Each structure stands twice: as structure tokens, then as C-alpha cells.
């Protein structure tokens, strides 16, 4: 469906809203599914408030959905995410990292393997530099070399760590031509611009202006089972757009199939988001696991980090179809000022990644 997609969606927006206010001035990029998957998997060895906070903090109402059905949700999500169509690359994995002489509840062990398909590794936390090396190695491998250094610090007492990675690589169903990419202005401010390489294409797009959001809404399909949604707010309407996004509205857009002519300008870019999940998630009512009272007892971990990297370009491949373009003048739709976007997996409809581009050359 997925049973938990609505929740993941709402989590993505809560978490986004928190990142946006404040910094207010920084590119934003994160994977809502990576964060929620790691903490749903963690919650499984917690109890009492510590536990409840986590699931509530993930936008699951506990007086509403059976806790078991959540984890079956995540189990089915993960299964699905790891069966991409052959023209799409999509992988996710969870890793557990354990001290040699650490007392582990067998139940917790078998839950994460079954529900979260987790791998498990013994490491020597006695050698802090080397344990980090081994953790960051799992990620480097999962991420095909792109992330060499997720974890930069490890408290001396730690005997346990949990990692989720997701790797996505996609090709546009209807790509841009490299010949047409040219340097244009990007309006970081109402009065300030920077130069960015700007892709463009005249084509028939699933594009519309939505009054409820005061934004243009563009859906771009990848070959295989995924879509990107881009949102361009009307002048002075970014905040309104940020405040009015809901699962229901996005679901509607996904259902729309009409195409119309537009001259689309979209920046070629790379952005990265790096987050300290303590301050950020504590702002969403997940404080206990970070503190002493932490009921870490269903297992037998204070620091939490998230890093996400985006790259967008013309095709997605060094490696045909024809659109009927009407006479009428096409609207010029330029993603040349701050915008929001969402990446959605098709089968699950889950929010793989979400972000905001304030300045592509930041």
C-alpha cells in the first residue's frame, strides 16, 4: 500500500519543517525512510517512554495502529525497496555493530534480522579508530564508494551502533540534452544571484500550478519504479508552500496524468545535508533514548547522525520517443530560485528523500 506510507510521509514533513525553521538559509537534504527505518529498528529494543516516544516521534499514533503491523509495514517496505525494476538502482541495508563481550537479548537479535533484514557484526570498540573504520566501511560498501566517513566520532564507552544506508541511482524517462545545458542565474535572494549550470528542455510535462500551495508542481518519472516531485513556490510563498504540504495533496498529484507544454529550466546540481539527529529529533519529542533514563534494556548510544547527498543531471547514463508540442506559447518554468522536492518510490509510494535547494553552489 504501503500500510505505513502515510506515516512516513507525515514524518518527512514534520522533520522537514524542523530543519527549515531554522536554518532558513541552508540547502536541505535527507532521507525520511532511512531515518525512520533506523529508529523503528531501534525502538524494537526499547521500552516505556523511551520506546513510545520513538514511534510517536515517527508519526505513528500508538493508540491507533498495532505495533506489530508497523514492523510488518517496514519489513514489506524494505523488501519492496530492494526489488527495483532493472533500469533503476535502489538498495537499502541495515547493519548492527556489537562489542565482543556485550550481553545481547536473543529476541532483539531475531527481530531485526526478520523484520528489518539486518546484518550483524562484532567489532572491537576497544579500538575506537578501528571500530569507526569498520562501521564507515559498511556504509562505503552500501553506498558504492560515495560515503567514506559517515561516522566521525565515537564515545569511548559505546558497545553498540546501528546503521541504515540507502542508495538510489536513476535515469530520467525523458532526459535533457547535454548540448542545452548552459549557465544561468539562480536567485538565492530577491536581489542576489549566483551562476549555475541549468538544464533545459521544451517538452510535455506533468506540470500544474496549484493555488492551495501557491506553487508550480512538476512530476518527473525515472525509468523504473520511481518519481521526483519538484515544487516551485510563487514569489514570497516558500513558507506557505512548506507549511501546506500533506500526504493527501501529494497523493492527488501522483494520480494526475495530464501533460502540457512547458519550457523547463532545472539546475544540474549536488547538494548535501548533514544532521545531528539528537537536537533535531528531540525537537519532535524523542529525547529519552538520548538521556540516562534511556530504557536501552530490550537490547541488553547517545550520538546520532544523518548525511545525504544528491546529484541531479541530464540523463543519468553515458548511453527514443516523440512528444507532440502544440503551437501555443509554453509557460517558462524555471527552478531558478529556492524550491522543494521529493523522491517517491512507485510501488510503496514512500518518501525516499526530501529537500530544499536554496543555493546549488553553497
Amino acid at each position: 500500500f504501503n500500510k505505513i506510507t502515510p506515516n512516513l510521509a507525515e514524518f518527512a514533513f514534520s522533520l522537514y519543517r524542523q530543519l527549515a525553521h531554522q536554518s532558513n538559509s541552508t540547502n536541505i537534504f535527507f532521507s525520511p525512510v532511512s531515518i525512520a527505518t533506523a529508529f523503528a529498528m531501534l525502538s524494537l529494543g526499547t521500552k516505556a517512554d523511551t520506546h513510545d516516544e520513538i514511534l510517536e516521534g515517527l508519526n505513528f499514533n500508538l493508540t491507533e495502529i498495532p505495533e506489530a503491523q508497523i514492523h510488518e509495514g517496514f519489513q514489506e517496505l524494505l523488501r519492496t525497496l530492494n526489488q527495483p525494476d532493472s533500469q533503476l538502482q535502489l538498495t537499502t541495508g541495515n547493519g548492527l555493530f556489537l562489542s565482543e563481550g556485550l550481553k545481547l537479548v536473543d529476541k532483539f537479535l531475531e527481530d531485526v534480522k526478520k523484520l528489518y533484514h539486518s546484518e550483524a557484526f562484532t567489532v572491537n570498540f576497544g579500538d575506537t579508530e578501528e571500530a569507526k573504520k569498520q562501521i564507515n566501511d559498511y556504509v562505503e560498501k552500501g553506498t558504492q564508494g560515495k560515503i567514506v566517513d559517515l561516522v566521525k566520532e565515537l564515545d569511548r564507552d559505546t558497545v553498540f551502533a546501528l546503521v541504515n544506508y540507502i542508495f538510489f541511482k536513476g535515469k530520467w524517462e525523458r532526459p535533457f540534452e547535454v548540448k542545452d545545458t548552459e549557465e544561468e542565474d539562480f536567485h538565492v535572494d530577491q536581489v542576489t544571484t549566483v551562476k549555475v549550470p541549468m538544464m533545459k528542455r521544451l517538452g510535455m510535462f506533468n506540470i500544474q500550478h496549484c493555488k492551495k500551495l501557491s506553487s508550480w508542481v512538476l512530476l518527473m518519472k525515472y525509468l523504473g519504479n520511481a518519481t521526483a516531485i519538484f515544487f516551485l513556490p510563487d514569489e514570497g510563498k516558500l513558507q506557505h508552500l512548506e507549511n501546506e504540504l500533506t500526504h493527501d495533496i501529494i497523493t492527488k498529484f501522483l494520480e494526475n496524468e495530464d501533460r502540457r507544454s512547458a519550457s523547463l529550466h532545472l539546475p544540474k546540481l549536488s547538494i548535501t545535508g548533514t544532521y545531528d539527529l539528537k537536537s533535531v529529533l528531540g525537537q519532535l519529542g524523542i529525547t529519552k533514548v538520548f538521556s540516562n533514563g534511556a530504557d536501552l534494556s530490550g537490547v541488553t548510544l547517545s550520538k546520532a547522525v544523518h548525511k545525504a547527498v544528491l546529484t541531479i543531471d541530464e540523463k543519468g547514463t553515458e548511453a527514443m520517443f516523440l512528444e507532440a508540442i502544440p503551437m501555443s506559447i509554453p509557460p517558462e518554468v524555471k527552478f531558478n530560485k529556492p524550491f522543494v522536492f521529493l523522491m517517491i518510490e512507485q510501488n510503496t509510494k514512500s518518501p525516499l528523500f526530501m529537500g530544499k535547494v536554496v543555493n546549488p553552489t553553497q
Binding site: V139, V305, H306, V309
Partner: peptide, 4 residues
């Protein structure tokens, strides 16, 4: 890329 999430680590706890």
C-alpha cells in the same frame, strides 16, 4: 546514511 543514518547511524546511531
Amino acid at each position: 546514511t543514518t547511524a546511531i
